Design a protein around this ligand. Structure first.
Ligand SMILES: CCNc1cc(-c2ccc3c(N)[nH]nc3c2)nc(N)n1
Length: 277
């Protein structure tokens, strides 16, 4: 392994993302002219807020990941006040930006991108890892328009916390307990949102959003692709042991075999040419 990289190795540029405890900044390494997305975390603030476990878990998780549909951790370093993580640079930014830009996806685009998300989840779940906060903001688009999922501090590695309100599963609001199915719940929401242009549970505030979730209070627009609707209904199920794709439903085989995915070749998605948006 090379000697530890340092801030002076980079020409920093624009801000790519902002969070409570971190900022992501585009940086060009000078020796290589390579673009990384460098996640910068201020030690003092992290310690002051008891986030050390989350930072730790993100670093450890993103190291165990080796797959085209996941943002990669290339390196780390620190100076006196800050931690730096060198991450894949997803040139095209958030899936959310495209949902907003074009409104809603047609069937072909919805099918391809849902399949990539599914295939990524299958990989993540095979390593015993749960994202716990999957959402279109976390789902980045590479320069070639394939997905790269990021943001893993809130992940759990299988042998407390609440993600974004509209993607939260009922079992979180009723038990403080999660599992792979929580990721599948969020997948159901993301599919709905690709198709309809909006997340299925919307309300004036978080409390109300939570109410609708535990009540399964949402419904399909009339233009919704039927096969996608059937898939979403097999995902947005209050009982987590009955969500298509989870272990009690015998996993990813039956999920991938869903009629909505009829025309999909699962084996080499990352090699396929994403449909034009
Ligand atoms: C501040 C939000 N928290 C985050 C943000 C990102 C992130 C954001 C944008 C990115 C891009 N355009 N390429 N790579 C990126 C990584 N990644 C993690 N892990 N956590």
């Amino acid at each position: 392994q090379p000697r530890k990289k340092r801030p002076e190795d980079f020409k920093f540029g624009k801000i790519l993302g902002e969070g409570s405890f971190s900022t992501v900044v585009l940086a060009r390494e000078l020796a290589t002219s390579r673009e990384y997305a460098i996640k910068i975390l201020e030690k003092r603030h992290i310690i002051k807020e008891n986030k050390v476990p989350y930072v730790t878990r993100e670093r450890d998780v993103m190291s165990r990941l080796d797959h085209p549909f996941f943002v990669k951790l290339y390196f780390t370093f620190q100076d006196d006040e800050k931690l730096y993580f060198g991450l894949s640079y997803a040139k095209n930014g958030e899936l959310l930006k495209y949902i907003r830009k074009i409104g809603s996806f047609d069937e072909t685009c919805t099918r391809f991108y849902t399949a990539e998300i599914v295939s990524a989840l299958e990989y993540l779940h095979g390593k015993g890892i749960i994202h716990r906060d999957l959402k279109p903001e976390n789902i980045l688009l590479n320069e070639d328009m394939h997905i790269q999922i990021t943001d893993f501090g809130t992940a759990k590695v299988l042998s407390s916390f609440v993600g974004t309100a509209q993607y939260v599963s009922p079992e979180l609001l009723t038990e403080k307990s999660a599992c792979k199915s929580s990721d599948l719940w969020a997948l159901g929401c993301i599919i709905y949102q690709l198709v309809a242009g909006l997340p299925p549970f919307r309300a004036g505030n978080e409390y109300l959003i939570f109410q609708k979730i535990i009540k399964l209070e949402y419904d399909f627009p009339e233009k919704f692709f039927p096969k996608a609707r059937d898939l979403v209904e097999k995902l947005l199920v209050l009982d987590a042991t009955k969500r298509l794709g989870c272990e009690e439903m015998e996993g990813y085989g039956p999920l991938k075999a869903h009629p909505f995915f009829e025309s999909v070749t699962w084996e080499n998605l990352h090699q396929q040419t994403p449909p034009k948006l």
